């Protein structure tokens, strides 16, 4: 395990996701409100899935070698397995907060699936120049998602409770900033142009992942917006 | 890319799915009705997914070699990845049109999953005679789906709005004819008996795919059946 | 096929799932009640999926070799493909019976996904001692599911119809006993410590699978709890 310099960040990531999972699990024990239960379920599952995939990367299972540029390049494929399930759960948290219509939710989840799926294909593609074609398609799917979060959701939040409108606005802003960093790190890291070494890349993704999951969850689950308006 | 004679049909397929995706995306921009949004979301996602998988076939990612009959046989596995997601979306379009009950929808999607999954296993099976066992099981799942579309849905459409009944009937008929061709092409093509060469097989699937997705979508999204009855 | 001593149990399993599938399919033909249709759909799909995966194991497709302990160890990976889809369907049968809230259903299905997914990783892991780390995480996800079935569902059933409360209690008890055997068989069988040989392991899983699917389904589909209260 320690044979890879990036192991320290995989281990820290595993620990922080594990701790985040346990914290949300305990916190949600005292919850009976049916609406709050939905948000706790979604939000606890996110770091639990990430915990398993960080562990698989730490132990070496979630790593494969991909030939491109005349080299055997270490590619952590387990990231995409994580993201396939956790990024639509994160979007679902946002969509339920603002009572999004079903068509909009399906558009978001579908675009998200395309985003992660094409990122996976790009990560595993052996023809170097083609990796960036997949990156571009994935990034276009991301831009669609960000567009919807701003010009379909923000003006939906404003007709809702003030506490859900303010909580949505904060989580929207956190999401757009954090999620936009992922394609940049991929592009300059070992999957793309290879300018930033894998150990630093792994650190960067770990900070983004913990912030986008445990950070996000801490903000959401401390808000009164997750509860039905009750006396 | 041009090293494979079937590349021209993969390229045309990619282009037509891409163009179809953009057309539906633009067309649905001016839509606020919650019901119509569902149909636009579902129907736009279908060629978008197909676009990505056609591209993966064009670039060579979605192709593998399978030993059977003492030969290395080129198998485009990306078709099944496409179909796994797009065929239940197509069925969902039909089921929502007639306000199908939840049990019926689950039966359809489940049978569809079995249909595509067993087709994939058959496509990748190395014992030649066993490929046709999987083809038979998949075809039985197809026949179940077609049965339900006729003797569970058609008489559901007739108690609904005339515009939804007439639109459903047309899309049902398009679906049954087009979908029934797929097992025949598989059986006589490079996956099955090998009587029709891969380049012609690829052409045939491209015509079926564009018709079943973009053709289907053009009929559906031009109907007033996708809108709630409103003043 | 007969080259593997466990083939007889794979063949019997295939037959019993096939027969169970046909029986439930015929039985549900005379059903119009929308609630009952849901239970028939879910419950018929379960042995149908299991039939396909038992067949893939019989024909040899669903088997791979995994190096650990200095040996090539036969691992039937198709079990996890089965279980990935059938165990959440089984939980859905239980959850719908007691009209579980959406948050609880998502927690169950999510924990179940983690349970099966980590079992799959453990089954395919090449470092022997690490296989048991994945077994432990999977078992913890199982224990969560069993906890919810007892201390979240049982007291939900009691405020419902007596026929649904009594049917739920029986199916809950069947589920907890049968499902708890699976991690034990894995641990002592060819995936784990290797004390029980593969042919006996295969027998054990076949008895558990038929009981947990066809047995379970026979109890559920003969109950009046699956019908809406109607005059
Ligand atoms: C009911 O609605 C609220 C339940 O949501 C909360 C439900 C949770 C989503 C349940 C899912 C967590 C499972 C219990 C997962 C089990 C293994 C976990 C990964 C635990 C890992 C952390 C520990 C090992 C440090
Ligand atoms: C509604 C939304 C969910 C829409 C989803 C959007 C989605 C369509 C976007 C594209 C997804 C698609 C790229 C998934 C591809 C998975 C694939 C990378 C798995 C690895 O297999 C690739 C090659 C080795 O590189 O296998 C070597 C050759 C092997 C023989 C491969 C044969 C097995 C195939 C992988 C079977 C395909 C199954 C499905 C792709 C399962 C989807 C997995 C998940 C990653 C989407
Ligand atoms: C809101 O409900 C309506 C939105 O549906 C319409 C929503 C669409 C389903 C959004 C999904 C499309 C994504 C934007 C996919 C991005 C890449 C596409 C494959 C674009 C490819 C076509 C172009 C490259 C020729
Ligand atoms: C409700 C509905 C959805 C019901 C669904 C119906 C469904 C049950 C029908 C059968 C689906 C099942 C056949 C999927 C099999 C996928 C498999 C072909 C992927 C390729 O792996 C096959 C061999 C190489 O040929 O791998 C070589 C050996 C490797 C070590 C394989 C180990 C990895 C396994 C593939 C893990 C299994 C994961 C699940 C099958 C994911 C499902 C993928 C999708 C195609 C259904
Ligand atoms: C409508 O709601 C009730 C339908 O549920 C019942 C619907 C069923 C879930 C339909 C799914 C079964 C498909 C017809 C599967 C076809 C192949 C089967 C595996 C048949 C195998 C058994 C036989 C070959 C012995
Ligand atoms: C809401 C709930 C559903 C939550 C779900 C919980 C879930 C997160 C729990 C963990 C699931 C995760 C372990 C699935 C891993 C599948 C993996 C074993 C498939 C086989 O690939 C493993 C190695 C060979 O051993 O591939 C060799 C290297 C290859 C290059 C691998 C590259 C292809 C990757 C497999 C692509 C990943 C796609 C997704 C994992 C699809 C999920 C399949 C299913 C088994 C969950
Ligand atoms: C918890 C993990 C999260 C929130 C991950 C988010 C990841 C993305 C938004 C990834 C986006 C990518 C692209 C837009 C193109 C390049 C490849 C990706 C997959 C890194
Ligand atoms: C957009 C793509 C569509 C509508 C594809 C439909 C495909 C089928 C109905 C495929 C059916 C098959 C069988 C019935 C058995 C042989 C294998 C298949 C998968 C080709
Ligand atoms: C129809 C099949 C059923 C009901 C299978 C149930 C399987 C399980 C509950 C498996 C549990 C496992 C663990 C808890 C850890 C070890 C690995 C598994 C996957 C066997
Ligand atoms: C969105 C953030 C992307 C920028 C990442 C900056 C990383 C700077 C680290 C120094 C680069 C290491 C190069 C020498 C090894
Ligand atoms: C459902 C349509 C299946 C029939 C396809 C007919 C294809 C005819 C093309 C000629 C066959 C090529 C054989 C000589 C290369
Ligand atoms: C939950 C049941 C697990 C116990 C399984 C008992 C199997 C006993 C069979 C005898 C073991 C075979 C060892 C000699 C080959
Ligand atoms: C490819 C995996 C996509 C599914 C991820 C799980 C999250 C799905 C959330 C469903 C949202 C509800 C839509 C109506
Ligand atoms: C194996 C992939 C199956 C899922 C495909 C996505 C479409 C699912 C549509 C869900 C229909 C709603 C059922 C209640
Ligand atoms: C990884 C596969 C998980 C999906 C299995 C299919 C069963 C899903 C049942 C959905 C229950 C409804 C939740 C709201
Ligand atoms: C186009 C929608 C406006 C809100 C999205 C902001 C786009 C940020 C760009 C992210 C950088 C990705 C490379
Ligand atoms: C049995 C249901 C009647 C409607 C379905 C028509 C079946 C068409 C056969 C398709 C050919 C597949 C090989
Ligand atoms: C902790 C919840 C109480 C009900 C679950 C009973 C646990 C049975 C243990 C199963 C054995 C697995 C190794
Ligand atoms: C070796 C790099 C070749 C450049 C490929 C860039 C493709 C980016 C596509 C953006 C439309
Ligand atoms: C080499 C071909 C052997 C014939 C197999 C046909 C099987 C079809 C099954 C239909 C019930
Ligand atoms: C070779 C076996 C080494 C023992 C591993 C047991 C790990 C079990 C983890 C339970 C917390
Ligand atoms: C990680 C295993 C958890 C089993 C005990 C249940 C914890 C309490 C959860 C309350 C919903
Ligand atoms: C509760 C702490 C969980 C941390 C387990 C994984 C950390 C890796 C240590 C090497
Ligand atoms: C908008 C046109 C999209 C076409 C891109 C793929 C066509 C392949 C050209 C070689
Ligand atoms: C209807 C009987 C189904 C049995 C088919 C599979 C049994 C395997 C026989 C070798
Ligand atoms: C993006 C950083 C999130 C910070 C989380 C802090 C949570 C405290 C309530
Ligand atoms: C099956 C062929 C479909 C033809 C689509 C034409 C759409 C015009 C409205
Ligand atoms: C766990 C054993 C189940 C027994 C099923 C018998 C069904 C008869 C109604
Ligand atoms: C990591 C366990 C958290 C302890 C409880 C925190 C207050 C709910
Ligand atoms: C008003 C919300 C500001 C949140 C910005 C957080 C940036 C990481
Ligand atoms: C809305 C601001 C987006 C900031 C992008 C930051 C990418 C590192
Ligand atoms: C391909 C872009 C379509 C242009 C608009 C067509 C009329 C909505
Ligand atoms: C009355 C509907 C006829 C549609 C037939 C289309 C055949 C491709
Ligand atoms: C309902 C008519 C079906 C026609 C099947 C055509 C197969 C090529
Ligand atoms: C296996 C076929 C079952 C025959 C009908 C049983 C009574 C519904
Ligand atoms: C009162 C229900 C008892 C069911 C026990 C079944 C054990 C297999
Ligand atoms: C509730 C009793 C569980 C029995 C476990 C049996 C495991 C073989």
Residue numbers in the entry:
A (entry chain A), B (entry chain A), C (entry chain A): 4 to 234
From the paper:
The best characterized system is bacteriorhodopsin (bR), a light-driven proton pump, due to its biochemical robustness. The retinal chromophore of bR (Halobacterium salinarum) is linked to the side chain of Lys216 via a protonated Schiff base (PSB). Deprotonation of the Schiff base of photoisomerized 13-cis retinal and protonation of Asp85 during the L→M transition ultimately results in proton translocation to the extracellular side of the membrane.
The time delays between the optical laser flash (145 fs, 532 nm, 5.9 µJ, ~500 GW cm−2 in the interaction region, see “Methods” section) and the probing XFEL pulse were nominally 0.5, 1, 3 and 10 ps and 33 ms. Data from the nominally 0.5-ps delay were binned into 12 groups according to their actual time delay covering 0.24–0.74 ps. Within the first time point of 0.24 ps, the C9=C10 bond also distorts and undulates on the sub-ps timescale, while the C13=C14 bond torsion mostly progresses. The largest displacements, in opposite directions, are at atoms C14 and C10, while C8 undergoes minor distortion in the same direction as C10. In the present multiphoton regime, i.e. beyond the two-photon regime characterized by the spectroscopic data (≤180 GW cm−2), the situation most likely involves population of several all-trans excited states Sn followed by ultrafast multi-path electronic relaxation (≤0.5 ps, phase I) leading to hot populations in S0 and S1, with distorted retinal conformations and longer vibrational relaxation times on the electronic excited potential energy surface, compared to the single-photon regime. The C12-C13=C14-C15 torsion angle changes from −150° to −135° during 0.24–0.74 ps and refined to −112° at 1 ps and −100° at 3 ps. To accommodate the shifted Wat402, the carboxylate group of Asp85 reorients within 0.24 ps; the Asp212 χ2 torsion angle as well as distances between the carboxylate oxygen atoms of Asp212 and Wat402 show an oscillatory behaviour (~80 cm−1).
